[model samples]
Target: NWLGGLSRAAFPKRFVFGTVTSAYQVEGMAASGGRGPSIWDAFAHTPGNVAGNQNGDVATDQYHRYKEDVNLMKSLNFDAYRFSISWSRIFPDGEGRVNQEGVAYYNNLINYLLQKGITPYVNLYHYDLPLALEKKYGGWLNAKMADLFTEYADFCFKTFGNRVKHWFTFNEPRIVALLGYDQGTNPPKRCTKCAAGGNSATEPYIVAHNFLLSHAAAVARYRTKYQAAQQGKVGIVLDFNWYEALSNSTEDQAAAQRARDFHIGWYLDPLINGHYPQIMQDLVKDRLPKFTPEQARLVKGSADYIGINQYTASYMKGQQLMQQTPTSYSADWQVTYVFAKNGKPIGPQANSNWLYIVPWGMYGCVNYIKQKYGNPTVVITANGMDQPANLSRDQYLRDTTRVHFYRSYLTQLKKAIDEGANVAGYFAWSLLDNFEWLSGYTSKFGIVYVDFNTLERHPKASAYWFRDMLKH
Candidate 1:
């Protein structure tokens, strides 16, 4: 059966089908074309930061081969391509001088997509902060990032707003805050234990506050300036993993509730309710930053729609975590995530250790949004799993597991839509194999397999699966 006989016709009318890629992940020539260094450039270049000691300096060479890639999307019958624009690329120093070459590249990409009858869904940022900004100030820690980001958003809207109708202001801002500031596992690594010496208790809160400020300001700018004339939509992409309580006990249920509040509710509640989650305000207390009344008004109802990148689900159980006292966001969260309960897996594990394929979570996540946020329109901005890169080319090309992941996930997604969840679209995690952040080239999340050796692109089985499925 082709995706169990699931056809594009099976989804809601005019439901969008697309593939996603971040500029830093797929675009090579990182230092060329007048692109300034991003925190990723530094992180990847540093020997110990990335797995395989690899970097995206010449990732998939999409910087030069975007046409071929776009054509692949055309062949797959995708209706849209969601790609990010590199901030450091357009403003090499993140704000000094405009880089005409960068603009020209996107202009051509946008024109080509329209020419091929494919819509361009543009995400303004995807984790790659211009290195200059981090150095000049503390990146998202300083409120200055909000203003600088709005300036950059203003530039993008003024220049490319006509062709790119959908704009996502930031991708997974919470990840940026927690990972960048709290865990210090990713770029601009900063935590209490790390040499960079960051207070995880406070920095993540500040980072979240600042980036939301950035998102709200950008949305306000677009609503005022471009939305009036260009008729475009602006949004922020958040990553969500449905939280299932580990046990039926009251405490476990409460823990799951707290996890949900801390996870989606941290960002979504503020945008919808104009304040932090009541639980978070209670738990985090003085550590959490307060949004000024003006900021709250701006953040509330800022998005035309919410875009969520969902891949899997987790089981949450509470822990005291306050061994001595609350230290970080995770500690304040007071939840332990487990993949199993009663000796059974959640669903199955993907190549990525953290990714557990639980199709029902798709149903849970979507309906949770419907129930919690009053059914605001949501686009499943990303959903897909990766395979290990050590596999044979033949294995990578077949990619049956990835195909299975999509089939099951989409089936659950369709069920959610049938149940009145207002999900409008879904984009797979990537279009091609490229540099995966910390995993580097070790993890391949693409439907199109890329030969890193020669930068050659080959459509994997999942690509054809999408082609036949979307043969709508």
Candidate 2:
């Protein structure tokens, strides 16, 4: 379904309209300079983890060709560009040092973006824990690692905060929690020991609790110190996919609640209410994890704004599927899910596994946030569609699938704004297509398509469409 068209001029001037990319996903030179290995480096090397044994060792060579990329963004007229800093690249050993090479790389990139009139929104971590950090502290499993993260955040604010006006503490914390700790989908992928044979729930919550404390600590540090002088906005990006109850049955509704609680609810409840939802606690059998009064105070209202990455919605129906084997990620959650067929859903397919065209999910998430969290302000931090692997760059450019997704989602967002959800901006998932994680180089989600071999770019239909939309 074609949702609607976005005329660029329709949104207000203060609204942020931009595209995003990540350091690792786009930038090659993983082993170049003095950069150390991140968890991703390990994950990519682990046999069978990534498709086709593909790795980003030389993904897009953005490290060597960022200037051309910036020019592409300038040509597209984006107001901002969201990208991440590689922890290992910045401080290869994770602490007690700074990598001048890493600093120089970002310095040049930031200066280039500023020269091009695009605001830089910096994200400190995107699941690429430095191999050093993981080795020393077991990654996020230990609370002292929280201090390490704080040190890293402080380093970023002191170094780049001068030019970058927006800082994001973490991207999609729930995903980091579930995938890294519970499912082992990504590197250092380890199901909690407590979830022996994939039947326990307490371990995941404890891991999540640790993640929250770390985020809150980082945000608090920024607010107390960085915000005073830096004068930039800091927030946490939480990923939320709309959940629809599959049926009127109480069981289905309750299952939906658990899914939300585990997914968005885990992060949202902690940020807004200073704790995980009671249902998460009650259902987990062990009360899994929790916040002390002080920690709750620290985590609550920690964000200046909330950045949301809304994707597809799923059906919620109770299922009696076999318990997850301990070796698998889902086994820890101990819950079963059933995918609801999209019965005449709106929009066309983009590429890869993500179904194209689901705007209502965005609208629903906005409404849910507003009603549930006192109508706090938000920004669409990440949203986009992919093209099939074999499609030509030009064919993938216009991206009718993504065009429809954006319109529908934005239309619902407009309504949410009219009703006062306090949404401030929208950022496309990517500024230019680069390296996609796990799926590797196959999916194209960038407005500007990259030629992997030449590190060359071609503006796709979506890029021109964005230009057309921005002419407002």
Candidate 3:
């Protein structure tokens, strides 16, 4: 253990330390080897959806260099590597046929990680839906996705469940629903008044409902068909931000609670309580989806653990009253996300506009889940800061800002653990800087710097910090 008295020893044994990357972000060879296009491929190809129209067609080339990357994880003493499987890669058109080449790619990857003594915490989906499925039916908006997603997950469990004991059904499904359908900022780009054509008022709710059903269906399939034999646990990953009320005023207090309800409660309520948050039911009325008893039974207790991707904290103030009916989900939230308070910022901003460094947010976020959601086994599945993409190799490799970010954040994480928050693992958001979605390659979040042009990886100072801290 090194600075701040932090290390693997600071937490319980078997509490995992790892790094994470998603298929679309790092796994290049997008069109190679029987692989079909995903909605991200479609969206990234469309004019002006992504920054500079940058897409991850060959970003970092981890598909071809996964062994090197896995070895990098080994060098840094990361216990696990949390990567995702591309749905379209396995089932090219999203269903019906199996792709042996795609299967072989993951087989090799998992085998190599195991060979090098790195555990694989694999996720089933990370926002990239098969383009064919989106075109055939209106993607997550339709109820048909549940059956399709379950079938896809069933295949994954039967095939890879033996070696990969830790499984996540989906990474940040809320982001998929909100960014894709509600905000119209990501793939399939549909929302109220969006050129892509959708009712943000209702589509986010419908899509999120289907996402939960699909997760429940997949978890049920894993439990019934695979868990007994494979002994693997499945959970869902959620992205949550800690919200602090701007003042002692009751109005601000109510606003903060409402913001939390809309952000994390939107997903966690169904996973635990078997229904949408009561506040949602009261406000959204008929627009928010309902779960039949059968669906509720399935959705409840679906997660073996819960993965929270806690990024930053914000000051929340109650604001923005509804005009007539709620125009969108953001409107429905009815809270102003104030990043600064009393003329001071929450913390240093990261390269990504959305991420602000708030170490205590880690403590606040973990304890909130423990207190509000009941202390389920929580995994800090994604946490890290990014550097701007314009830095030189020397500047990127130094990464003092990111180093401080990790130490300070993990210190707060340990504080939460000391207070009995029941968190079991921590995964740095990225093993390498690949494709950051809307910001494109402009934001770098990797502990290991990737030369986008050369596809070369250089371990940054933070990597060595982990290497030192992780020493037993």
Candidate 4:
């Protein structure tokens, strides 16, 4: 019964339909257009760091082609667009002088989006931290990073709040902390033994703590100064891959719960309840940072809504884990994540190793957040599948699999919403296939395929599928 007779008509009249993309992932002109270098720019340029050493220097050329892209969105009948502002583009050196060129670019973007009837959902940080910040002040590891982030966000609100009503302070802070500090897989690649040396055990926590404070400060600033005048809302985007227990055993159930706590609860608890999860407190012990009474007050209820970017789910099993010699955050979880249970795979795998197609996970994800977090306003900020980069243009254009993926996931989402989840919007992962971080341009997550050589966009069958579903 998946997607049978399902349409936007099945949901609340105001539920939003849009597509999402980050600046570094979509907007090119990385070196030009008065944009400062982001950690991603630096990371991608390093030999062997990114597949094919591909960088976003000229990704899709969206810096110059946004008008065409917006028109594509319009033709597709999307009512909204979720895009990010490049902090480095706004403040090239991460602070001090404002780049008017950067300011003009976003003003142009927002103005055009409105002119064409597409609402703007702007995110401030999207893994593209200015490289200057990392080199100067140790990036998010320092408490001062929060102040820097707040200052940047403050400027953005003052500059753009008149038109951009929906704001996300940071996107996927969990990924930022874990991948950058703990795993050394993303930008500023830091870990205990990586070339960009860092304390894997302590740095991830410090970075995450600072990110929480930064988000709190930004929300506080907006609520204090801009909200009444601008009538805007501020929130953070969290990536929650639903964790299902491998079995009904008490230990497995506990392991799945612990995985949830460690994943989304790590940041969500502080934002919603003003405290770290009790489980985290017990596990991380002295190594985990604590918020002061003042900080706690600021953090509590900081988000007006919760932006969840859920794509896949994994199976969890209890493991008798011990702390490593270096004591990484991975050890802190003390659980194993698998994509199968009882010799059965959770679902089919996607292009990315981490992505698996388990449509029902979407239902569990939203319902859990609704019941667990007092049913705060939820925006499904990102949900989509990817394809291999090697697929022929003709083959990729026939994206029947993506159509089915969206249909199955959306059916689950509709069920959750019908059951009283306060979800406000749903955004597909991308508006175009652009720079896909470490995978380079080797992954296609976009419904609109861009011919890399020509920078020409061709809408796949999935794009028209969305058009059909969204067209009133």
Runs in model 3 deviating more than 4 A are 319-323
Q: Which ten residues in a row have the lowest lDDT in candidate 1?
A: 318-327
How well does model 4 score by local distance difference test? Answer: 0.91
lDDT per residue, candidate 3, 1-472, as tens digits?
Answer: 3367887778888888999999999998899978999999988888787888999788889999999999999999889999999999999999999999999999999999999999999999998899999999889998999999999999999899899899998888788888888889888889887887998889989999999999999998988889899998999999999999999888898888888888899989999989888778878889998899999999999999999999999999885455457788877877888888999999989988888999999999899999998898999999999898788999999999989999999999999999999898999988898899988899899999999888899999999999998875
Clashes of 4: 0
Worst 10 residues of 3 by lDDT: 318-327
**Candidate 2: C-alpha lDDT:** 0.77
Model 2 residue 273 distance off true place after TM-score fit, in angstroms: 1.3
Model 1, 15-108: lDDT tens digits are 9999999999999989999999999999999888899899989998998998999999999999999999999999998998999999999999
Q: Which candidate do you rate higher for TM-score, 1 or 2?
A: 1
- Scored by Cα lDDT, where does model 3 land? 0.90
Candidate 4, residues 177-296, lDDT tens digits: the string is 899999999977899889979878888999899999999988888998999999989989999989999989888899999999999999989988989999889888877899999999
Q: Each candidate's TM vs. the true structure?
A: 0.98, 0.91, 0.98, 0.98
Tens digits of per-residue lDDT, candidate 2, 1-472, equal 2324466555655788888777889888999888999988988987887876778788878898888888887787778888899989999988978889999999999999998888888888887789988888877668787799999998888888888888888888677766666666666666645322322244456567777888889988888888878899888888888777777777777677677777777788888888777765655545466578999999898888899997767666765434333343244334455454546443355576655456777887889889888888898899887776777656766677666666767777777877778888888887777667778877778777877767778887677777767753
Each model's lDDT comes to: 0.91, 0.77, 0.90, 0.91
